[PDB]
Amino acid sequence: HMEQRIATTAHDLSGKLGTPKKEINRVLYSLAKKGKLQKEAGTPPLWKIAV
Amino acid sequence: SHMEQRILKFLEELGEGKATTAHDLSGKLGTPKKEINRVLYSLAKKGKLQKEAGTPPLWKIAV
Amino acid sequence: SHMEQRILKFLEELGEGKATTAHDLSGKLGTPKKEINRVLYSLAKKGKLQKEAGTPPLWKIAVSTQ
Amino acid sequence: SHMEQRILKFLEELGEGKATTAHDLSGKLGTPKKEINRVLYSLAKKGKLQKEAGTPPLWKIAVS
DNA sequence: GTCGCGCGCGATAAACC
DNA sequence: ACGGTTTATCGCGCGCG
């Protein structure tokens, strides 16, 4: 159900949603493989939505 | 996405609730099994296919 | 397969309650995780251990479901 | 850290513009692949190595 | 502080045809 | 004088502190 809820960093999403950062990056890279999201370069990386 | 369509069309053509293996796909489509499993497990990560754990695994159209 | 006996003897120790991961076994036994896992997967197939799917997967002593 | 010196030594003795995999380096040099990759990725960060995209990744001397 | 990692994978045993 | 080839969860990309 975590995927249904979800630029910003997974660092920010972890504190905003109260979820371990490991689980946030897991759903981001999954939906990024699903194409719905796109990752921008940064440290930590930036995450935006693809239209 | 071209290889993804040959796999999805066959599974869709091959019955409405039937599954098949990567080996069967390898033969029917004339493609090394490595390329088939590369696409199959990718479609499973995308949610396009449902994987039945087995030896070999069985692949069916996903929700 | 000399390590697989040390894997079980470490697993059978403190084995009434919880389980452990392969990364923990890699450090506990001073063995590269490449050998720990391929011993574990061979151990789970032999019926001496049971694999609990996870991230990372957890490994314990096999529990009879007879 | 003489592991970096022998990796570049192997890729140098391989040929001009020749590339190989991390799994091939692990066996020819007798070193765990876990150690090989952490150096190959580091040598690319220093700019001394270039990584061809693929599966597995192909490693060659940088033509930067 | 990037990190998502689940990985065992063959220096293969076994199975196949 | 002689079983070659493919499977196995085999999909692996992994380097991770």
UniProtKB/Swiss-Prot annotation, chain A:
Induction: Isoform 1 is induced by interferon alpha. Isoform 5 is constitutively expressed. Sumoylation reduces RNA-editing activity. Residues 3-51 are annotated as: Interaction with Z-DNA. Residues 3-51 form the Z-binding domain. Ubiquitously expressed, highest levels were found in brain and lung. Isoform 5 is expressed at higher levels in astrocytomas as compared to normal brain tissue and expression increases strikingly with the severity of the tumor, being higher in the most aggressive tumors. It is linked to Dyschromatosis symmetrica hereditaria: An autosomal dominant pigmentary genodermatosis characterized by a mixture of hyperpigmented and hypopigmented macules distributed on the face and the dorsal parts of the hands and feet, that appear in infancy or early childhood. Homodimer. Homodimerization is essential for its catalytic activity. Isoform 5 can form heterodimers with ADARB1/ADAR2. Isoform 1 interacts with ILF2/NF45 and ILF3/NF90. Binding to ILF3/NF90 up-regulates ILF3-mediated gene expression. Isoform 1 and isoform 5 (via DRBM 3 domain) interact with TNPO1. Isoform 5 (via DRBM domains) interacts with XPO5. Isoform 1 and isoform 5 can interact with EIF2AK2/PKR and UPF1. Catalyzes the hydrolytic deamination of adenosine to inosine in double-stranded RNA (dsRNA) referred to as A-to-I RNA editing. The third dsRNA-binding domain (DRBM 3) contains an additional N-terminal alpha-helix that is part of a bi-partite nuclear localization signal, together with the sequence immediately C-terminal to DRBM 3. The presence of DRBM 3 is important to bring together the N-terminal and the C-terminal part of the bi-partite nuclear localization signal for import mediated by TNPO1. RNA binding interferes with nuclear import. This is Double-stranded RNA-specific adenosine deaminase. The lineage of its organism: Eukaryota, Metazoa, Chordata, Craniata, Vertebrata. The chain holds residues 140 to 199 of 1226 of the full protein.
From Swiss-Prot, chain B:
Disulfide bonds: none annotated. Residues 4-63 form the Z-binding domain. Induction: Isoform 1 is induced by interferon alpha. Isoform 5 is constitutively expressed. Signal peptide: none annotated. Sumoylation reduces RNA-editing activity. It comes from the Eukaryota. Ubiquitously expressed, highest levels were found in brain and lung. Isoform 5 is expressed at higher levels in astrocytomas as compared to normal brain tissue and expression increases strikingly with the severity of the tumor, being higher in the most aggressive tumors. Residues 4-63 are annotated as: Interaction with Z-DNA. Catalyzes the hydrolytic deamination of adenosine to inosine in double-stranded RNA (dsRNA) referred to as A-to-I RNA editing. The third dsRNA-binding domain (DRBM 3) contains an additional N-terminal alpha-helix that is part of a bi-partite nuclear localization signal, together with the sequence immediately C-terminal to DRBM 3. The presence of DRBM 3 is important to bring together the N-terminal and the C-terminal part of the bi-partite nuclear localization signal for import mediated by TNPO1. RNA binding interferes with nuclear import. Homodimer. Homodimerization is essential for its catalytic activity. Isoform 5 can form heterodimers with ADARB1/ADAR2. Isoform 1 interacts with ILF2/NF45 and ILF3/NF90. Binding to ILF3/NF90 up-regulates ILF3-mediated gene expression. Isoform 1 and isoform 5 (via DRBM 3 domain) interact with TNPO1. Isoform 5 (via DRBM domains) interacts with XPO5. Isoform 1 and isoform 5 can interact with EIF2AK2/PKR and UPF1. It is linked to Dyschromatosis symmetrica hereditaria: An autosomal dominant pigmentary genodermatosis characterized by a mixture of hyperpigmented and hypopigmented macules distributed on the face and the dorsal parts of the hands and feet, that appear in infancy or early childhood. This is Double-stranded RNA-specific adenosine deaminase. It comes from Homo sapiens. The gene is ADAR. The chain holds residues 140 to 199 of 1226 of the full protein.
